[PDB]
């Protein structure tokens, strides 16, 4: 004979197995990947829209350069820096995918989405970590954009906020920007972070050119 507790256990461990199967039926890394695709699509939309402002500058200063060419030159310098930083970050994403296993043959997604060993050593260990170069170029871009905005408006707050490389304290403990952004994260979460940095670059370029457009 089985006790009432034992009958409950025998019937319930299968129910708890079903509950566990439901708990983990969704891969949260595939969710991060799909959200990264949505973010990339929206960034592509942004850059498509701001590609028209370049044509606008071209046509505006191709008829009267005495007042618009000085702002096209001040604008295409923003374009070059923004595109160079975007290409740098895209190359970093490609390097991270490549050293991990590459694009899956069928799913068209990186093979190793939880390969946080190679990701961690590439970002923070090997040759001092590629993340230090990331923050160096982010700071360079932020300073160049600050000196391409001759108004000292709220755009400065935007630039300091999007590209905030300053130390962030967790539990009253000091950690660098490169450690508060890329440490203990899998590849499935780091790529969305680099794509978010690319989105920040595109948004900064867009709303700096917008201000630099209403001065022509």
């Amino acid at each position: 004979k089985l006790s009432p507790r034992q009958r409950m256990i025998n019937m319930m461990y299968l129910v708890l197995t079903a509950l566990l199967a439901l708990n983990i039926s969704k891969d949260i890394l595939e969710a991060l990947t799909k959200l990264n695709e949505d973010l990339s699509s929206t960034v592509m939309t942004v850059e498509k829209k701001l590609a028209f402002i370049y044509q606008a500058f071209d046509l505006a200063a191709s008829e009267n350069p005495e007042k618009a060419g000085v702002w096209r030159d001040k604008a295409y310098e923003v374009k070059k820096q923004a595109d160079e930083l975007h290409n740098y970050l895209e190359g970093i994403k490609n390097d991270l995918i490549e050293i991990t296993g590459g694009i899956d043959e069928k799913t068209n997604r990186p093979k190793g989405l939880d390969n946080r060993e190679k990701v961690a050593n590439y970002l923070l260990v090997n040759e001092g970590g590629k993340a230090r170069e990331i923050r160096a170029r982010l700071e360079q871009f932020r300073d160049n954009m600050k000196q391409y905005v001759d108004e000292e408006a709220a755009l400065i707050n935007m630039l300091e906020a999007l590209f905030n490389t300053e130390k962030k304290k967790v539990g009253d403990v000091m950690i660098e920007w490169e450690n508060a952004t890329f440490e203990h994260f899998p590849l499935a979460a780091v790529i969305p972070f680099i794509t978010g940095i690319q989105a920040n670059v595109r948004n900064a370029e867009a709303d700096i050119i917008s201000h630099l457009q209403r001065n022509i």
């Binding site: 129910v15 079903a18 199967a21």
Partner: protein
């Protein structure tokens, strides 16, 4: 009453209800249409079964040392 004809019936209704629970949990994993109804009927039945199991008389728990020393 919790004598013979009830405990014997209350033990069949545990096996039948448990079968419905396991089938309902399988359907919930697969997301079929009958998953919610079989889980409500199956799990509410077993909840009643084990409420009445709280009043079962426990096993006699014989002590053979009284009969056989040095045991």
């Amino acid at each position: 009453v919790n004598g013979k004809k009830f405990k014997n019936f209350l033990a069949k209704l545990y096996g039948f209800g448990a079968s419905i629970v396991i089938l309902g949990a399988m359907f919930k994993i697969l997301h079929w249409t009958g998953a919610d109804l079989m889980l409500i009927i199956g799990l509410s039945t077993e909840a009643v079964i084990f409420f009445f199991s709280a009043f079962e008389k426990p096993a006699p728990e014989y002590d053979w040392t009284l009969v056989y020393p040095e045991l």
